[PDB]
Amino acid sequence: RPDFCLEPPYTGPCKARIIRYFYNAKAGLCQTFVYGGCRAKRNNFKSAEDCMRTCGGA
């Protein structure tokens, strides 16, 4: 549903290659993206299902 759900995915400054999920409102789905390890924003989920529970509907 929300507003943080509309933000674009944020990798951040750390240099790990960690695959996380973000709600892609234009698609109307949760997609994967490379998360650097640190300073995540709220549109960053460890599984598709936590993504769809939190965001799906935005």
């Binding site: 990798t11 400054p13 750390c14 240099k15 790990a16 290659r17 490379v34 650097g36 390890g37 300073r39």
Partner: protein, 223 residues
């Protein structure tokens, strides 16, 4: 133009790949059971892969060993990235050969302008996405504290150093985190963070290992 080069199979025999289903971080073998890595690389279910070159194909020199313990430095700050160091104890001890060997911890801090080798399986493209099969190497010098602090204002603690080229183009990037900066035989740094990768005037930032050497030996010994 890709700043670094393919080191060649098994020529950085202390480089490890941390895996949780895929390659997510690197690290360095400091003895037959202990690995050093970054604190932002901490995850559940780490497997350590030793003796890799191509991380996508089994070439017969590998030893895959699960971690038994993962100890993030007690003072890691996840906002400041200060103290970004972790140790991982293997479930069983590796067997050390000539494709699997460990790297010596330093006795002193390297100075500015020391040339080092940075290695990893991380993104080879400054803008873009291109994670290689095989291990990549990068000779970069250490930068002065002064100019690291000018690069990133108000963000560098005593436990950080900068390295690379203010021009840009040659740097470590997503995937490389936790792997080694080896200078004159000794382990000096752990790949850590940056403003992007391989940007003009923003060198990569590394954990300064020379400050942790007491903490490391005493934590390995009492675990």
């Amino acid at each position: 133009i890709v700043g670094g080069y393919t080191c060649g199979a098994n020529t950085v025999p202390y480089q490890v790949s941390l895996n949780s289903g895929y390659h997510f971080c690197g690290g360095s073998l400091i003895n037959s059971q202990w690995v050093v890595s970054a604190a932002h690389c901490y995850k559940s279910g780490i497997q350590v892969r030793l003796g890799e070159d191509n991380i996508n194909v089994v070439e017969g020199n590998e030893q895959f060993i699960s971690a038994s313990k993962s100890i993030v430095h007690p003072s890691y700050n996840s906002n400041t990235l200060n103290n970004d160091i972790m140790l991982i104890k293997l479930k069983s001890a590796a067997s050390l050969n000539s494709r699997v060997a460990s790297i010596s911890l330093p006795t002193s801090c390297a100075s500015a302008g020391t040339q080092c080798l940075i290695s990893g399986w991380g993104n080879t493209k400054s803008s873009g996405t291109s994670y290689p099969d095989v291990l990549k190497c990068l000779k970069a010098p250490i930068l002065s504290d002064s100019s690291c602090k000018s690069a990133y204002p108000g963000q560098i603690t005593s436990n950080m150093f900068c390295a690379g080229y203010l021009e840009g183009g040659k740097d470590s990037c997503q995937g490389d985190s936790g792997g080694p900066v080896v200078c004159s035989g000794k382990l000096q740094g752990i790949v850590s963070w940056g403003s992007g990768c391989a940007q003009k005037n923003k060198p990569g930032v590394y954990t300064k290992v020379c400050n942790y050497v007491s903490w490391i030996k005493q934590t390995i010994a009492s675990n």
